[PDB]
Amino acid sequence: HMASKQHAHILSLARSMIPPLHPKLHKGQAGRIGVLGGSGDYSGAPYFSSMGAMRFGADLAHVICEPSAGAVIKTYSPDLIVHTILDPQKSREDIRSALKGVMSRLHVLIIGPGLGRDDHMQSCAKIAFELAKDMEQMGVVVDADGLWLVQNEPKVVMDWPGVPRIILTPNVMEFKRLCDTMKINASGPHTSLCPQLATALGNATIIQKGPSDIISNGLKIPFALLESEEEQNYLEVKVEGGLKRVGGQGDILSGSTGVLLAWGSEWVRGTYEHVGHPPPQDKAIKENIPVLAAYGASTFNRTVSKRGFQKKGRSMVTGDLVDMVGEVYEEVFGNPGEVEGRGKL
Amino acid sequence: HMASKQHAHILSLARSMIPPLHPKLHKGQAGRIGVLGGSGDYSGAPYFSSMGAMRFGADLAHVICEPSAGAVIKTYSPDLIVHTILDPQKSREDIRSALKGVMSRLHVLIIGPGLGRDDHMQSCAKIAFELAKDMEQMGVVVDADGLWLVQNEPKVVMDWPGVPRIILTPNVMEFKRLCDTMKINASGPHTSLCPQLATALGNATIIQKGPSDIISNGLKIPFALLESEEEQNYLEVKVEGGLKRVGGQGDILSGSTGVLLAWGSEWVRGTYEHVGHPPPQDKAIKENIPVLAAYGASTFNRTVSKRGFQKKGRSMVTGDLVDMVGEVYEEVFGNPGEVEGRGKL
């Protein structure tokens, strides 16, 4: 009842972020997404995140990685632009300037897929956090060992200028580690842990992944989204996912999260006004693009896993899901948005 | 009305360039196409152009690139011949002679896909421009950073011997940069900019890519193609394309442009006379092979993007389009040409 209406309503708000597929748009206005990771042996995760982003709808996806992983990742798909610029044989200044060059061409950077924990790649991720901080129109999604960096240096996400534009996606153990760093007591009510952590991290948006996902930026969900009672300060996605717990499904999530974050950010900026999607009136929607991107992506990713599991069952691997992103996008966003009168979504 | 009749007529002339698939032809007479590019990290664009060329109908497609990109590009397809001869550890003379060896086996060289802007690859492209200039039966298609070289040294396309045989394919910004180099005033009428630039570049044929494509070699479109009024000096392709602005669709265009340029050039040379396609009577058609190849490829590429977008929608990537070149070729050229009595096209 209430839960179904609220879920549909918030999903509808997420759908409102999506630019129409319109003759007047040119290459790049539907999203330029970067994935920073791919160290050493970790080839699959940055592919899943970046190719997931392309199948979800990005015009361009960039992978920023080390040379060895980069050579593998390029063979998976000619549609990815793979920058092997995190070469430990390069000076730090050269890496910083190479990273700045690529990042200046991005709406959103996903930090973490296949990043690993060694000093070099962690330092490269820290550089990227620092550049993103000072690029006010840059969104950031943090996953995998990107979250290890936050756990070690939480200030990398704290006190950013501009609108809020960070989404963290910890699994159960990554979340517990984050809470321990921020001295958040685990005896708290289960649904209060995520808003506490988000608050302690300067109201970044956090997707706490699990049997259900708990989403929060630490603030109450404004009237535009969620009587005499205050609106909840978290959202819980319980939509049916898949039953096969094969590795990589969080990378589909980060890639699709990054795309929705880029679209919603460009939407609020006014980029889609000339194709009939002007920014929203309500300041609360502008301030909550990360929560809407997060809620939409969480919902979508479980639906992708559900459909992949219906097709493949016990045999499902995450590579299968990359091929199903398009049809599930059409189910969740494209066909509903078009029937809603939003244009070809 | 008039626009539909003219479009169909010019497309019919482009179709007349296509050799029949005939038992008497042997390997290579339906096109030996080269793509010069593939530097550093840029793996996808030369694949899209060269594999697009093969799916369009070339007998052999060659990629001329650096070793690192070449190793990736080879894994995409055993049908491409990848020459990793642009090795910066090789002497210039060795590169020149290696390039000359491969180019002497080509009808057409596509310069630019994944070329990049660094001194080495730009110098390799300049060598290739110089050899092509002095190989009178060699056609050239210039895209991507091949156009950066022209923008820096426009003489590389000026004063070529033989028939005109160069086609440039700038997008909106590349076109503006070219106009600035050639001191062409942007206040001019919109459809007069492309013929002015082509004229300033010695009547090379230019595809100005955009919401529609404007095609011109700077000269009026002769009576064979376009009362008391002079024929237009440009053609405009407005056929429906796709709505997904994913990167790489200009590489499908360059590969298909290169194939049509090779076929039309061999056709005028007399190569297909013994299989029932003698050269055209009209000198204007011979002088306008580049415009016909350009018009046919522009039309075809938007139709490919249209069909790929109908199948994949928001999820379309350019890799999907490579697989659809064959069926769209059959729609645009093969089945119409056969019903026209041109043989199995």
Ligand SMILES: Nc1ncnc2c1ncn2[C@@H]1O[C@H](COP(=O)(O)OP(=O)(O)NP(=O)(O)O)[C@@H](O)[C@H]1O
């Ligand atoms: N029990 C569950 N039932 C259904 N969906 C689930 C379940 N647990 C997690 N998910 C979903 O599966 C995806 C990945 O979640 P989860 O396995 O918790 O993260 P992870 O450990 O980071 N995965 P990975 O990408 O392999 O590193 C998310 O979309 C979750 O919502």
Ligand SMILES: Nc1ncnc2c1ncn2[C@@H]1O[C@H](COP(=O)(O)OP(=O)(O)NP(=O)(O)O)[C@@H](O)[C@H]1O
């Ligand atoms: N708004 C549009 N609607 C439909 N087709 C378009 C539109 N803009 C460009 N095209 C076509 O898309 C293809 C690529 O054009 P365009 O994006 O302008 O070039 P580009 O920037 O060089 N692309 P790329 O190959 O990624 O570098 C051409 O076949 C164009 O005719």
Ligand SMILES: [Mg+2]
């Ligand atoms: Mg994970």
Ligand SMILES: [Mg+2]
């Ligand atoms: Mg281009």
